[PDB]
Amino acid sequence: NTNIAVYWGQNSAGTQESLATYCESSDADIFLLSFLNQFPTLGLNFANACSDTFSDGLLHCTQIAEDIETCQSLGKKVLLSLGGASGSYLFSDDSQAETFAQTLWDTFGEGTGASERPFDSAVVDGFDFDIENNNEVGYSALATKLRTLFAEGTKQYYLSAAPQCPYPDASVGDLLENADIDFAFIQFYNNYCSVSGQFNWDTWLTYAQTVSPNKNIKLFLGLPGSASAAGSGYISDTSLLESTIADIASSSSFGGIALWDASQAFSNELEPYVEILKNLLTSAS
């Protein structure tokens, strides 16, 4: 497959534009809103892109809400990503995480429980698990309970995770092994297993075909968008990309490329970096 996924929200480049600006590009297909960085007590952070709040401090983001709807009219998928570098999140047990599934459904999905909605009447297309605190409690139970609740909705919903390339991942490995997940946005950067390093794509294939509860899970080549975007692992060689893309694009388990983040990949020229990669995907396709 040929999808480009981009994280958006954390303003890695400094020059982050509105969510809809990136959706109005031909260059990306899936958008991970970064992040619900605090839970189970809810807290969002989208850098400069949302500053208003409900009275209780929870972000209230009318521009992002409108942009989710615009993005979706244009055929894009927009998931809410949980986690990030805050580490201001943790489940004590599965029961707590199951209760939290309902909370997410009613707050961000098509649940009818009357909760405060950061995105008003906009409805996300699902949830990404970008967990970074090396604590795995609750995520598989959360994902599983979400799958039951989604049947009440009126569109398809997606779950994804954002492991780093070392396998198994210390934060989302359990989730990946014990829940039905649609997409794995694997960070092949900041690690020994970078595409230039000891590229461990084959391990992730073995995972997809033999371990993943969803045998049809799609694996994404996760990359920095610019120099800049990451301490190590940024690629310029169109180069290995072409070959790498070629090497990995043969399997039905290949879903495409995932980028950290939109602000970086769209502004970094090299022609916007995201455009170079979109075109390598279709032409390598």
By C-beta, is 103 or 187 nearer to ligand H35?
A: 187
Contacts of ligand H35 in 3-32 (CB under 6 A): 7
Of 105, 125, 126, 128, give the one whose Cα is nearest residue 115: 105
Q: How far is the CB of 211 from ligand H35 (least distance, A)?
A: 19
CB count, 10 Å around CB of 88?
14
The answer to whether residues 132 and 187 touch, using CB atoms and an 8 Å cutoff, is no
The count of residues in the chain is 285
Contacts of ligand H35 in 33-72 (CB under 6 A): none
Q: Which amino acid is at 153?
A: G
84 binds ligand H35 (CB under 6 A): yes
Of the candidates 185, 199, 254, 266, which one interacts with ligand H35 according to CB under 6 A?
185
CB count, 10 Å around CB of 236?
11
By C-beta, is 44 or 230 nearer to ligand H35?
A: 230
264 binds ligand H35 (CB under 6 A): no
Contacts of ligand H35 in 151-170 (CB under 6 A): 162
If DSSP codes are grouped into helix, strand and coil, which group holds residue 205? helix
260 binds ligand H35 (CB under 6 A): yes
Residue holding tokens 């986690």? 83
Assigned token pair, 9:
């929200």
By C-beta, is 91 or 185 nearer to ligand H35?
A: 185
Q: Which amino acid is at 213?
A: P
The answer to whether residues 187 and 173 touch, using CB atoms and an 8 Å cutoff, is no
By C-beta, is 12 or 72 nearer to ligand H35?
A: 12
Of 184, 70, 71, 79, give the one whose Cα is nearest residue 125: 79
230 binds ligand H35 (CB under 6 A): yes
Size of the site for ligand H35 (CB under 6 A): 12
d(CA 60, CA 225): 28
Of the candidates 109, 118, 222, 255, which one interacts with ligand H35 according to CB under 6 A?
222
By C-beta, is 80 or 105 nearer to ligand H35?
A: 80
The answer to whether residues 152 and 111 touch, using CB atoms and an 8 Å cutoff, is yes
By C-beta, is 187 or 253 nearer to ligand H35?
A: 187
Q: How far is the CB of 85 from ligand H35 (least distance, A)?
A: 6
Q: Which residue is nearest to ligand H35 (CB)?
A: 222
Of 171, 168, 96, give the one whose Cα is nearest residue 134: 171
Q: Which stretch binds ligand H35 (CB under 6 A): 20-28, 41-49, 98-106, 256-264?
A: 256-264
Residues forming the active site: 132
Of 102, 150, 159, give the one whose Cα is nearest residue 129: 159
Q: Are strands 43-44 and 30-38 parallel, antiparallel or unpaired?
A: antiparallel
139 binds ligand H35 (CB under 6 A): no
Q: Which stretch binds ligand H35 (CB under 6 A): 97-105, 140-148, 210-218, 255-263?
A: 255-263
CB contact set of 271 (below 8 Å; sequence gap of 6+): none
Q: How far is the CB of 259 from ligand H35 (least distance, A)?
A: 6
Q: Which stretch binds ligand H35 (CB under 6 A): 15-23, 59-67, 170-178, 258-266?
A: 258-266
| Footprint of ligand H35 (CB under 6 A) | 7, 84-85, 130, 162, 185, 187, 222, 230, 258-260
